[PDB]
A paper describes a structure:
Here we report that histones are major chromatin components in the bacteria [name] and Leptospira interrogans. Crystal structures (<2.0 Å) of the [name] histone ([name]) dimer and the histone–DNA complex confirm conserved histone-fold topology but indicate a distinct DNA-binding mode. Unlike known histones in eukaryotes, archaea and viruses, [name] binds DNA end-on, forming a sheath of dimers encasing straight DNA rather than wrapping DNA around their outer surface.
To understand how [name] binds DNA, we solved the crystal structure of [name] in complex with a 35 bp DNA fragment. It employs the L1-L2 motif that is conserved across the domains of life, although the sprocket arginine that reaches into the minor groove in nearly all other histone–DNA complexes is missing. Surprisingly, rather than the DNA bending around the positively charged histone surface, the DNA maintains a straight trajectory. This nucleohistone filament, which is characterized by a histone to DNA ratio of 1 histone dimer per 2.5 bp, reverses known histone convention by completely protecting straight DNA from the solvent. The crystal lattice we observed suggests the possibility that bacterial histones might generate higher-order fibre packing through the interaction of histones on adjacent nucleohistone filaments.
Author numbering:
A (entry chain H), B (entry chain D), C (entry chain H), D (entry chain D), E (entry chain H), F (entry chain D), ...: 2 to 64
Write the structure that this text describes.
């Protein structure tokens, strides 16, 4: 259930910017990264008493 | 540019798992996170001498 | 009998310079071009009474 | 740089079909002709919207 | 020019019947055997004043 | 069963080099000759303790 | 630390009996199966107050 | 026949992790377990249409 990335555009980016192919399992791991980022965003909004996940709730300072 | 996440499923997961809405720019920064994961993947693959970004090249331990 | 081009290096050139794949039948047509160029080189050397095909005998002014 | 022709078979074809030797730089310019055919092939494929250099993209009618 | 054997089916036969791999140069030698067999078949038909190579013109009594 | 020769190129070589046609069963027996060469190749490789049928295992001196 | 299967003989068995290749990660999973079987054998001997793992302590009734 | 486990490391793991000795036929049945896992792996791969026994073909959930 639920693939959260747009496969064709991810592949195009990796081909265009990196001159590489993309494994199918790569798409799966990226989808799981999105899942984890949204779950943390929801916990970050709830800890602030808001009802909307905002860009500031998406934490990528470890990126 | 370029939306790399499936917006409808991101919103559906956030509403279904946290009851919240999803701001517009949340999609934007989720997409930026994908771009960065993909570009690190290309660097990981290049350092392995490979031409394919594989699951092993996408590290999401910090998320 | 006789493939006259170095397949792996032709493919690498097209991938590197053109960001493209190479069909197997492409290698065949390039080999036939080499065959035609050598046959004309031999006729060009013979018309000059020489026993050696030289660079000047390889005509690519139609290129 | 980069030799794109199979030198031993080029020499063997020239000796076997014309009884002649093959100068060193004959290989060099045969290789240059390959580079040019490949680069025109990439342009032909791009104008077709393709990502693969195919036999149809290598025109050797003038040779 | 001209590979006269069907590579994939030759490899399958050697793998299936002999439990072995097949070198690429093996395919070349088999193609040359076919070339020699057809050239002799043409000489055998011509010596009989026929215009068609037939099975009887393919001599493998030395096999 | 199994056609092991490239019929179109066999016919083209026979018409181009001898001006003749090629009967149907000529292909069949050419294919049988391939089967026999391959099976002798497997025996040659086995007697060398190898697992790969190589050019050295295909003897076509008698043809 | 510790590869518990004899790689070359496992590969030979799969090639001989199954006519197949063996992935390197296959050897790893088999080693882990051996590790799990010995750990259970030790618990089975201890539960009987013995100091020696015996064949009867190696349980493969789920096999 | 054929010992498929590394006896010295099996014994060392059993002595180091349980302080016990290892009977002779324990090695024998550990080896039989390997044979059976490999033969099920071949069946799993065949049902996938593959020619390689991979990690996915070795199921050790029941152990």
């Amino acid at each position: 259930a639920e693939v959260l990335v747009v496969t064709s555009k991810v592949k195009k980016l990796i081909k265009e910017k990196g001159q590489m192919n993309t494994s199918a399992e790569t798409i799966d791991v990226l989808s799981k990264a999105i899942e984890q980022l949204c779950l943390k965003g929801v916990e970050s909004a709830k800890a602030d008493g808001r009802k909307t996940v905002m860009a500031r709730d998406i934490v990528i300072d470890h990126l």
